[PDB]
Every structure is written in structure tokens, then in C-alpha cells.
Paper text:
ZnT8, one of the 10 ZnTs that have been identified so far, is localized in the insulin secretory granules of pancreatic β cells and responsible for the accumulation of high level of zinc inside granules, which is required for the packing of insulin in the hexameric form. ZnT8 functions as a Zn2+/H+ exchanger. The structure of HsZnT8 in the outward-facing state shows a ‘V’-shaped dimeric architecture similar to the crystal structure of EcYiiP, with the two TMDs forming the branches, whereas the two tightly packed CTDs located at the base of the ‘V’ and mediating the majority of the dimerization interactions. Our structural and functional analyses reveal a total of 4 Zn2+ binding sites in each subunit, including one primary site in the TMD (STM), one site at the interface between TMD and CTD (SIF), and two adjacent sites located in an open pocket of CTD covered by a HCH motif from the N-terminal segment of neighboring subunit (SCD1 and SCD2).
Subsequently, we introduced two mutations, D110N and D224N, at the predicted primary Zn2+ binding site within the TMD of HsZnT8 (HsZnT8-DM). As the primary site functions as the transfer center for Zn2+ transport, we reasoned that by abolishing its Zn2+-binding capability, the HsZnT8-DM mutant could potentially stabilize the transporter in a specific state. Indeed, the double mutations appeared to further stabilize the transporter in outward-facing conformation and data collected using HsZnT8-DM sample prepared in the absence of Zn2+ yielded a map of the outward-facing transporter with an improved resolution (~3.8 Å) as compared to HsZnT8-WT, allowing us to build a near complete model containing 302 out of 320 residues for each subunit, with the help of the crystal structure of EcYiiP (Lu et al., 2009; Figure 1—figure supplements 3, 4a). The structure of HsZnT8-DM reveals two adjacent Zn2+ binding sites (designated as SCD1 and SCD2) within each CTD, in a pocket encircled by the U-shaped loop near the C-terminus of the protein right after β3. As the HsZnT8-DM sample was prepared in the absence of Zn2+, the bound Zn2+ ions likely come from the host cells for protein expression and appear to be integral part of the protein with high-affinity binding. From the structure of HsZnT8-WT determined in the presence of Zn2+, we also observed cryo-EM density from a third Zn2+ ion coordinated by His137 and His345 at the interface between CTD and TMD, which is designated as SIF. This Zn2+ density was not present in the HsZnT8-DM structure which was determined in the absence Zn2+, suggesting a lower affinity Zn2+ binding at SIF as compared to the other two CTD sites (SCD1 and SCD2).
Numbering used by the authors:
A (entry chain A), B (entry chain B): 52 to 56, 61 to 198, 210 to 369
The structure:
């Protein structure tokens, strides 16, 4: 019948906790260490307490993306609302890029305006919690689902940014004669952030461009299909992916003309669903006749 | 043979001119009206001459997206590099959102710091060219290809932003007693920008989520297919789209068991390619047997 029905359902549920819990943890931390600013110096933690609101924002946005992904397939969005996950993830990552650019420009400003001073010891304790809080905010998002993996890279990034004042603070406190080791620290650590976002960006860009999923390999799939009896030649094998774990596949095959078709494609479906989980298959089951010199449109992926 | 080979090839060529020409026009304008700043007041046009560089940047980025779209299909990117167009377009539009947010924040700053003054007559002539130049930069991008349509919305947006100082300038010159009609102008006109970007964003988001293309209609396609003789029931009709004009389709059909299959799907392909151009079709041609009460996974798009 070519439609097979808890292994997937439960996973949407786990992340839903791995985010709501992390969002709540960041909520607690932001609340506490902002009320610890009104009842003390009022320009102490707000600047750090800022970032925490950004992380919370990204976490709630990723959770919103999950809730969207839950929605059922419609007439307009046929396959379902799945890629909403990847979309929210890519939006969050571009927001990392934007926020980091903003921070780098403010660092350059502080450089061009060295007329500024901050007590280099209380500057550390405020950094330590920010590092510690980020340590916790990361280890909960330790990968997975495109949504959580987008929140982790978003969290880890803050960690490098978080120490980027601590490791700077110590160098300021232990030798305030320098005063210009902080901007270079923000620079290099923003670059580290950007490297991690480069990894995730490459992966989700390959996803959005209907690229074959990393988890698989095209020529391996052609071998795996052609390794079945009745077939003679498989042309136009396209295999893209939905968010992460919904691999689709669509192929033309040319089988033994006098052979019964439907058993051949049934066997192909069994072989494929045996090697790896699917989400749909539409094998066209063409005939022996094919205009081979003209199949250049479906000769093979050049690569 | 199910593979049919100048109607499409020439279109990549037209836009390639509709961008390179517009990029060059903006290049000319920026050059001229920046050298008209060194040889006069040096804080006159640079701020306007700034956004021209942003428009040029977006135009060259869209052209880069086109050049990517030209690349052939590979083993990793099976369908081809097509959606690179949509990706570059969405990036450019999010950059519109970012730049407009930046401008709105600087407007709020000018508000909270009314300690500032600018001659309200020379402020107009610098605005008029910016409006005129934007008038020209837009009417060349008058739509189409996802790349150009992304450059037009990007250009038109600057127009509203461009007059957003002129219409402000006049009100400053004709009554400098007000001095606070400029921020509200930037506000409302940024909102207009954001509305246009909302339209384009909705469309390309529907595209990226494998939504059926606007140009078509699902139930219309089911009627158009089921209107052919041999078929009995079509389930799991998925029809997404590549960038704009590469519509794909993939369907299971259940036809008369004793009937010859391949003629049925050949006729379906003829009917579809008759109603509207395609880019691929993989009709599975299932049998009469189907487990109807269990097809809930392929019952129909709820909507
Ligand atoms: Zn062919
Ligand atoms: Zn089916
Ligand atoms: Zn079914």
C-alpha cells in the first residue's frame, strides 16, 4: 500500500522540553541578575543582562518554529509545515551574525574613543556568572533537531562572547596600562562565533537548496537501488530532504519489460526503507525504451 | 521518453542585463555624487551617498545569485543550483529589514538629541537627485525572475526612504519651528518599506517551504489529472516549486488494473505539460489495491 505509519512522535516532545526548560532557565537568570542591578549600581549588569534577553528571544523563537513544524500538511503547503524549523533556525543564525557585527562595531567605537574607564574587578564577577550562566545555558542544549541545534550554536556563541570580557577583564585588572586588549579579544572571539555559525549555515543551506542530505550519499543510493534484480537502469534520481530526518526520494527506473512492474518497485521500496528511513517515494517505473543519447537532461549529476 | 528539451534560456540573459545595467547606473551615480562632495562641503552628500552603495551592493549580490543559479546540477545538489536565487533574494530582503531598523534607530536618536541643525534648502537639492536617481534605479527594475524582483523591492524601498527626507526637508524649510516632523516621516515611510518587504517575504517563504506555487492551485491540479480516462484515484499529490518557474510534481495514481499503465501516465504527462510547463514528474502508477481506511497519511491535504 506504500504508506507505513512512536519513534518520531516522541522526538518533537523531547526538544519541546529541551527548549522550554532552557528558555525558563535563561528567564530566571535574566530576572535575578537584573534585579541585582536596581538594588545596586544601576549601570553594572544591564549591558550583560542585555545579551541574556537576546538568548531568551532566540530560544522562544526556536520553540515557536517547533510549534509551527507541528502543524499538519495543508493544500497550500503540501509536504507540511516542516521546513519552518529550518527557516526559524536560519533566521536565528543570521541574527547571530547581525548581533555580533553590532558588538564588533561597538568594540571599534570603544577603540576610537579610549576615553572610558571601568573598575576591572567588579567587571570580573559580573563576567563570571555570565560565563557560568552560559555554561549552563549551553550544556542543556548539548546535542539533532534543527531547532535545538540552532539554539545550541546560538548559546555556545554567547559563551565565547561571554568570556570575551572575562579573559579581557583579567588582562585589564592585572595591567591597566594596556587598556586596548579588550577590543582585540572581542575581535578574535567574534571570529570564533562566526566560524561555528559558518558550519551550521553551510549545513542548512545545503538543506534549503534541495541538496541530498549529509546522512546519505547519491552514488551509494544508485548502487543500493541498482543492486535489485529486475532493474536495468535508473535515471533522474533526485533525493532532497525536509528539515533533518524526513528524507524524500524520487526516481525513474527502467526494468525488464516483460517483467511484472509493481513487484519490482515494491522490492525497491523495501530495499530503500531497509537501508534508511524515508518520508515518501515516487518511483516512476518507466519501460525498457529510453532515448539514451537524448537523456542528457537525466544522464547523471555531473559533479 | 519523458524528457523534453529557447524560451527559458533567454530569460537568464535578460535579467543579467537588467541587473548589470542597473548596477552600473548606480555605480555612475554614486561616483559622481560622491566626487561632488570632496570638491564642496565634505559632510553634504556622504550620508545620502551611503545608501547608494547599499543599493549597488544588493544589485551585485542579486547578480551573484543569478550566476550561481546558472551552475549545473551536481551529485550533492541534485535538482541544480536554482534556489540560490531565492536564497540571495531572502538575504537581500532581510538586509533591507536590518538597514531600515538601523535608520529608524538613528531617527529615534536624532529625536532624543534635538541638538542638531541642518540648512533646510541645500538639504533639498541633495534629496531631489536621490529621489530622481532612485526613480531611475527603480524604473529599470520594473518587473519576474526572483533575482530582479528582489532588486526592485530593494530599490523601490529606497525611493520611499529617499523622499522621506525631501518631504521632510520642505516641512523643515517652510517652518523650522517644528524640527520634529522628520523622525515621524522616517517612521511612517520605513513602515511602507516594511509592507512591501512583507509581500515579497510571504511569497518567497511559501516557496522555500515546498508550498505549491501561487501560479497554480492544488484542487485544480487534482481535477485536471482525474479528468483523464484510465485513472480512478489520485493520492499523495505533492507539487512544490524551484525558484519561480520550475514547478515540480509527484503523484501516486490508481488506474484500471487490467489497463496498460504506461499509456495512462503518458497521457497524464501530456495533460499536465499541456496545462502548464513543468520541470519534472514522477507519477508512481500504483495499482487498484490500496488500503483506503489506512491512507490517512495520504488521505488528502486537510486545509
Ligand atoms: Zn533522459
Ligand atoms: Zn501511494
Ligand atoms: Zn495511503
Amino acid at each position: 500500500h506504500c504508506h507505513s505509519g512512536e519513534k518520531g512522535a516522541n522526538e518533537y516532545a523531547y526538544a519541546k522540553w529541551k527548549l522550554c526548560s532552557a528558555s525558563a532557565i535563561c528567564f530566571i537568570f535574566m530576572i535575578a541578575e537584573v534585579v541585582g542591578g536596581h538594588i545596586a549600581g544601576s549601570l553594572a549588569v544591564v549591558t550583560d543582562a542585555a545579551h541574556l534577553l537576546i538568548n531568551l528571544t532566540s530560544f522562544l523563537l526556536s520553540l515557536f518554529s517547533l510549534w509551527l513544524s507541528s502543524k499538519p500538511p495543508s493544500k497550500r503547503l503540501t509536504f507540511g509545515w516542516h521546513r519552518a524549523e529550518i527557516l526559524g533556525a536560519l533566521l536565528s543564525i543570521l541574527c547571530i551574525w547581525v548581533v555580533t557585527g553590532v558588538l564588533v562595531y561597538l568594540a571599534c567605537e570603544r577603540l576610537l574613543y579610549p576615553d572610558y574607564q571601568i573598575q576591572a574587578t567588579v567587571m570580573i564577577i559580573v563576567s563570571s556568572c555570565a560565563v557560568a550562566a552560559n555554561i549552563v545555558l549551553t550544556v542543556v542544549l548539548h546535542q539533532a533537531n534543527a531547532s535545538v541545534r540552532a539554539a545550541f550554536v546560538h548559546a555556545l556563541g554567547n559563551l565565547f562572547q561571554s568570556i570575551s570580557v572575562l579573559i579581557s577583564a583579567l588582562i585589564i585588572y592585572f595591567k591597566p596600562e594596556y587598556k586596548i586588549a579588550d577590543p582585540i579579544c572581542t575581535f578574535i572571539f567574534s571570529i570564533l562565533v562566526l566560524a561555528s555559525t559558518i558550519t551550521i549555515l553551510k549545513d542548512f543551506s545545503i538543506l534549503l537548496m534541495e541538496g541530498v542530505p549529509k546522512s546519505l550519499n547519491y552514488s551509494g543510493v544508485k548502487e543500493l537501488i541498482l543492486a535489485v534484480d529486475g532493474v536495468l537502469s535508473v535515471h533522474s534520481l533526485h533525493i532532497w530532504s525536509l528539515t533533518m530526518n524526513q528524507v524524500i526520494l524520487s526516481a525513474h527506473v527502467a526494468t525488464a519489460a516483460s517483467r511484472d512492474s509493481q513487484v519490482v518497485r515494491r522490492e525497491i521500496a523495501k530495499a530503500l526503507s531497509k537501508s534508511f528511513t524515508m518520508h515518501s517515494l515516487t518511483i516512476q517505473m518507466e519501460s525498457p525504451v529510453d532515448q539514451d543519447p537524448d537523456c542528457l537532461f537525466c544522464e547523471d549529476p555531473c559533479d
